[PDB]
């Protein structure tokens with residue numbers, strides 16, 4: 003029993019964190035095999051950030067301008083290349099702690115663990131979701147750039163995010179491990195803003211199924227809804243539209259609890275109208291949207307209470 | 308910016324998790340140097356749990372009755388002894404991954420990270436607090452016994468909890484690494500219940516300081532209070548009494564934000580008497596009490612390990 007915001011064990015990622023320095027700029031790098039991946043803005047000064055010409059800044063650099071530190075050992079850079087917004091530094095030593103891994107680009111609503119790091123040293127781990135507006139609500143200070151997001155389903159680490167910047171509202175933007183930004187963001191200091199954010203509907207439904215699995219049904223009602231009527235109501239509360247894909251994905255949780263997806267949608271419609279009336283659901287007074295259907299199945303018992 | 312429920316990086320603890328089997332009972336063990344620590348109830352059958360005599364159950368066991376598996380390698384048990392509610396299995400191999408460590412007993416209100424494990428394999432990491440009623444609100448299923456709680460100080464892991472059982476309300480109970488329970492619990496199948504819990508006042512105040520640091524100030528007011536008047540009000544809401552030690556501990560956060568501790572106590576009094584009025588603090592509609600003053604300082608400073 004219980005339901006917590008649970009991160010994957012971070013050990014496999016801790017053994018890949020290194021410090022990358024170019025001149026006065028220092029940030030984190032991810033060392034996999036003989037390559038260190040880091041944000042390309044490590045070659046920028048603060049002044050360069052308004053309109054940096056990365057190709058022009060990079061051509062003026064040699065391999066020995068990049069200092070890579072793994073623990074107390076200095077790695078030797080023997081090559082470099084830029085791929086989108088990431089810099090790939092070829093080093094003379096393959097990481098002996100390289101886990102089994104993949105690079106995966108995720109979609110909004112997907113969750114992942116973040117290993118926050120400073121000076122190549124891990125400080126903490128927490129669970130995040132890629133918001134519908136392509137930002138993440140992380141906890142990052144200056145020096146956290148290059149910290150990564152990942153999942154570890156089975157023994158393979160799927161790297162899905164690398165931290166690049168903090169927007170004016172205090173939310174965060176970054177790239178996949180191929181250097182492609184999530185969202186319409188650029189690694190430039192020009193005026194940029196997070197778009198209006200919305201609630202991840204499929205995740206709220208998954209978490210309501212987690213509450214039923216753990217023994218709570220107070221929020222259920224005798225009604226059902228059509229998918230279109232549900233979406234007309236949901237969008238009035240700034241909730242993402244629920245698609246047939248989301249309904250299909252909730253199938254297993256619907257079978258385990260015996261509650262049809264559109265019947266759970268009717269409960270959600272009522273919760274949006276009434277609020278909780280002094281009650282909580284899984285220790286929360288707000289509707290939680292950072293647990294996916296897959297996260298609920300992973301954390302909850304297969305036997306409903 | 309940002310504020311997340313953050314756990315310590317778990318790698319140093321992952322390298323200590325093993326699987327312990329005695330007959331039909333399988334659970335997790337902690338392998339440090341040449342000793343494997345695990346709940347002594349691993350020697351019990353379901354019937355034995357009703358009224359166990361652990362010395363009598365243990366005397367009937369030989370070293371080869373305990374199967375210890377570290378990854379895909381079988382460890383050889385060469386000795387065994389009991390210390391309070393913990394079984395210490397001496398093995399023929401010292402753990403090459405043993406980190407620098409200490410066994411520490413924590414007090415209610417203190418937080419720690421939990422590495423949930425099943426079959427000696429880590430599945431997730433989350434942060435929690437030792438409640439005033441000595442339970443923890445964890446997330447554990449069958450097979451999680453032997454999972455451990457810890458804090459990291461510089462490079463030293465301080466092990467503070469080992470999981471033993473779930474109470475009827477779905478909350479959890481366990482021991483320190485010397486086998487002494489937290490709370491008035493016993494390791495047997497008998498009528499046991501979590502006592503009435505209270506809110507950790509010093510932690511709520513720490514989290515209100517974190518909200519101010521992160522730019523949430525709507526709850527601040529011009530008023531102050533005495534420590535005695537604050538405690539008279541706090542007692543009415545099932546909040547733990549605030550002591551002069553708690554006021555002293557909040558000193559640094561008070562200096563950083565410019566808000567006296569008793570000034571923040573007056574904001575907390577108003578929040579208890581009037582609610583949030585449709586507002587949230589750090590994305591929560593409830594007053595959060597599972598962040599200590601030290602957790603707030605650490606997360607808002609980027610301390611690494």
Ligand SMILES: O=C(Nc1cncc2c1CCCC2)[C@@H]1CNS(=O)(=O)c2ccc(Cl)cc21
Nearest residue numbers: 043051142143144166167168189190191308
């Ligand atoms: O956003 C940035 N850093 C950063 C990342 N995470 C957390 C925090 C910070 C800054 C202080 C607050 C906490 C930088 C610098 N600021 S910037 O506007 O020059 C900028 C712009 C683009 C890129 Cl790719 C990067 C950046």
Ligand SMILES: O=C(Nc1cncc2c1CCCC2)[C@@H]1CNS(=O)(=O)c2ccc(Cl)cc21
Nearest residue numbers: 003348356447448449471472473494495496
């Ligand atoms: O509590 C216990 N295990 C356990 C731990 N974490 C999570 C979960 C469980 C059981 C299934 C549900 C989820 C056991 C069995 N139950 S018991 O009451 O027989 C018991 C009693 C004492 C001791 Cl030390 C242990 C136990």
Ligand SMILES: [Cl-]
Nearest residue numbers: 107108109112
């Ligand atoms: Cl995805």
